[PDB]
Amino acid sequence: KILEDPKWEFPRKNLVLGKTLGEGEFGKVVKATAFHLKGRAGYTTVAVKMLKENASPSELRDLLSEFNVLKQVNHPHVIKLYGACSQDGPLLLIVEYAKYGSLRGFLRESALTMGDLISFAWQISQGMQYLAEMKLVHRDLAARNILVAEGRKMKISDFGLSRDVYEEDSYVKRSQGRIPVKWMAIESLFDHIYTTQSDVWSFGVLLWEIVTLGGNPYPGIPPERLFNLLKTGHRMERPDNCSEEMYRLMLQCWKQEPDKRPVFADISKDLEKMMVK
Amino acid sequence: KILEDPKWEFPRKNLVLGKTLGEGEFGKVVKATAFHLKGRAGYTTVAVKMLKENASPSELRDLLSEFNVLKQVNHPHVIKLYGACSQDGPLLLIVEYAKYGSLRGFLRESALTMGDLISFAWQISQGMQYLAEMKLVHRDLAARNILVAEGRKMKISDFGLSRDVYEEDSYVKRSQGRIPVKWMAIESLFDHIYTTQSDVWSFGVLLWEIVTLGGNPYPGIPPERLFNLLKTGHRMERPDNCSEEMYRLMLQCWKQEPDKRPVFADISKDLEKMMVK
Ligand SMILES: Cc1ccc(-c2nn(C(C)(C)C)c3ncnc(N)c23)cc1
Ligand SMILES: Cc1ccc(-c2nn(C(C)(C)C)c3ncnc(N)c23)cc1
């Protein structure tokens, strides 16, 4: 029983699904083509996300949660929602198509200069600054949760775990322990507290992933040992393809006090100062 | 911070990990060899389960939950726990090794006669009757959660979501919506009620998977539409490789009233009557 919003409902007969682009804990995403989308004559190459054959109740809640947050945002660096098919069969979410795939895969498949990586971090920081202005916390901010559309333009994705900056619900059942530990902020890891400043912590780990072309954060460190490491003040070390100014930004994102961490508005200007220089 | 039980702690220096056997929502399972296990001189081919590099707090809780339930059971058709490495690094669970892999994959890879399939259902019903005697509900009973060791002997696995038949804890934080809908009992789907009779419902779906050699239950039916179908009394249809007596057993497992469903003790005798005849 899903409410069908007419502003986003799309006819299933006007949608042809193609080959599977990926399947896992996120769901089932297939490539597809949608004709007469948004009233524009012709067809459009899109991406359709659906539940798996072995989906659980929580898997639907995330797809509906992802559906809600995508109806409310709009940004050239946040994946765009085009339509949905909530009636007469399976639930399909029709969104923008990212040719080059997820960012974690795109970085691993690599020729990219250091200017290309700072551009990626700049785009992600731009969209995140917008989400902060939209009163949203992403929580699940990582390299795997970022898409790469055509033009190598970064697109923020996976809003199934996102919450409001101001809780606008009388009773919200709390999701528990669904954020990977190595991307969790120390206060989120210690008291289940997720904020925009916690996304900055997650963004700092994202910077580490980009400068390493899809590296595994805290290498060889069991995630069950990371709480003790972060509680004592230990962070990650300087990687190989990192400058003195770039590594300083990661540590500012990893400051213990969330007030001592920069906001995404400052991160965008800090990263542009690296692009110009 | 994990408590190290000396009855199950095993030295990491006495364990060599090999190639990865599988990775996903369940965790990371690698093939390995353990020397001087259980005091027996020599080495033993085992399987080691560990957390992923992007594991979340709940992923650890399941591994610890799976660890607890495996310390307490023993059956030739339930996977056997051999040891663990909870100190000085990553958390490793050392259990029995299943050469032929998961049951869902083993059925799909297939020459098997109808007698071979009833034998598999018999073995799974035997171990489940034992778990019911051990006051345990498995909940996540499916074909993917069953292993096939050497000799094509069935081994019940994945106890991360298992609960006690009698709740022996003052405050237990409830996991929510982690069982795939198509395997959920109608009362579990309607009021979050998981019991041994609900495992019989799940076992009936497992029978359907075996007689179809790893088929997808309720084919072409969106899992969001299954609650309405089961609430109106509709079940699955007779498959192709199913007898009149075998299909009757599935429907008895799918009876609305859980008291109207058979117990695993009767299922073992019902399946043996098919093996003899
Ligand atoms: C709502 C929604 C829908 C689809 C996706 C998505 N996942 N993925 C994979 C997982 C294949 C990289 C994609 N690859 C390309 N384009 C996409 N749009 C996606 C993400 C969110
Ligand atoms: C505690 C525990 C440890 C390992 C496994 C396990 N998963 N898997 C896959 C997923 C590769 C089929 C296995 N394949 C063979 N043998 C095994 N033992 C396993 C299950 C539970």
Residue numbers in the entry:
A (entry chain A), B (entry chain A): 710 to 819, 845 to 1011
Study text:
Receptor tyrosine kinases exhibit a variety of activation mechanisms despite highly homologous catalytic domains. Here, we show that the juxtamembrane (JM) segment enhances RET catalytic domain activity through Y687. Structure-function analyses identified interactions between the JM hinge, αC helix, and an unconventional activation-loop serine phosphorylation site that engages the HRD motif and promotes phospho-tyrosine conformational accessibility and regulatory spine assembly.
The structures differ slightly in resolution and in the occupancy of the phospho-S909 site. Phospho-Y928 forms hydrogen bonds with side chains of R873 (HRD motif) and activation loop R897 at the top and with H926 from beneath. The JM-KD structure revealed contacts from a short segment of the proximal JM region (residues D707 to W717) with a hydrophobic patch composed of residues from different structural elements including β4 (L790), β5 (L800, L801, L802), and αC helix (L769, L772, L773, F776, L779). Examination of the crystal structure revealed that in RET the R-spine is composed of four hydrophobic residues originating from the αF helix connecting N- and C-lobes; these residues include H872 (from the catalytic HRD motif), F893 (from the DFG motif), L779 (αC helix), and L790 (β-4 strand).
